[PDB]
Each structure stands twice: as structure tokens, then as C-alpha cells.
Amino acid sequence: SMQEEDTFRELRIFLRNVTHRLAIDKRFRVFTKPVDPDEVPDYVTVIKQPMDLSSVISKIDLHKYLTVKDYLRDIDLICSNALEYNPDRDPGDRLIRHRACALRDTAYAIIKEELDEDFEQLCEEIQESR
Numbered sequence: 138s139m140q141e142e143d144t145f146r147e148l149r150i151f152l153r154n155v156t157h158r159l160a161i162d163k164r165f166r167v168f169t170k171p172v173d174p175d176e177v178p179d180y181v182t183v184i185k186q187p188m189d190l191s192s193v194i195s196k197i198d199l200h201k202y203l204t205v206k207d208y209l210r211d212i213d214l215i216c217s218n219a220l221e222y223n224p225d226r227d228p229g230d231r232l233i234r235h236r237a238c239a240l241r242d243t244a245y246a247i248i249k250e251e252l253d254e255d256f257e258q259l260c261e262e263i264q265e266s267r
């Protein structure tokens with residue numbers, strides 16, 4: 138329906154604003170663009186599902202997220218990809234892990250404070266009805 142289309146539009150506007158706030162944070166610069174396979178050729182061979190905030194914007198705009206839960210799965214991937222690809226004790230890996238975890242924690246905290254649970258529930262019920 139048109140009302141359901143209006144619901145999903147509001148979801149996209151909400152998710153674009155959360156994603157923009159993550160992207161303008163200087164801590165999260167490394168997560169804003171896909172990993173250039175020059176600097177790191179083995180990335181795309183180790184990480185089967187690369188994810189970055191530019192890919193998340195593209196996905197929002199392609200109407201791939203019908204619920205905040207589906208968006209949070211892609212935020213979770215940014216964090217788990219970094220935990221998997223950068224697991225060493227050395228400071229370069231520890232810094233990327235801490236930034237990735239912080240991204241994830243930030244996205245969850247903004248959604249806890251700003252997502253209405255009844256809005257999420259509506260999205261979930263329209264999705265489950267398709």
C-alpha cells in the first residue's frame with residue numbers, strides 16, 4: 138500500500154541519518170569506503186561479505202533494508218569482519234577492532250535512543266506479510 142511505502146520511506150530516512158552520523162565521525166573513517174584491494178589483496182579472499190558505510194548507503198537507497206534489524210546485521214558485519222581480519226595483539230589491529238566495536242556500539246546506542254519500538258514492530262509486520 139501507499140501507507141506501507143510511506144513507512145519504508147521513513148525507515149530509509151532514519152537509516153540514512155544514523156549512517157551519515159557514523160560516517161562523519163573521524164574514528165570511523167576506515168569504515169566509510171570499501172577496502173582497496175591494492176593496499177590489501179587478501180582482504181576479498183579472507184572476508185567473504187565485505188561491508189562498509191558507503192555500501193550501507195547504497196543498500197538503503199536500493200530498498201534492501203525493510204527493518205532496522207536487517208540494517209543492524211550489516212552494522213554487525215562491519216564489526217565482526219574487523220574482529221576476524223585484524224585479530225592480532227599489535228596496536229594497529231587493536232585500534233581497528235576497538236573502532237569497529239565502537240561503530241557497532243554507537244549505531245546500537247543511537248537506535249536505542251531514537252528508534253520507536255512500535256515503528257520497528259510495524260516494519261517487521263509489513264516485512265513478515267510480504
Ligand SMILES: O=c1cc(Br)ccn1CCO
Nearest residue numbers: 153154156157158160194
Ligand atoms: O550524505 C549525506 C550528507 C548530509 Br549533510 C545529509 C545526509 N546525507 C545522506 C547520507 O549518505
Ligand SMILES: [Cl-]
Nearest residue numbers: 163164166232
Ligand atoms: Cl588513525
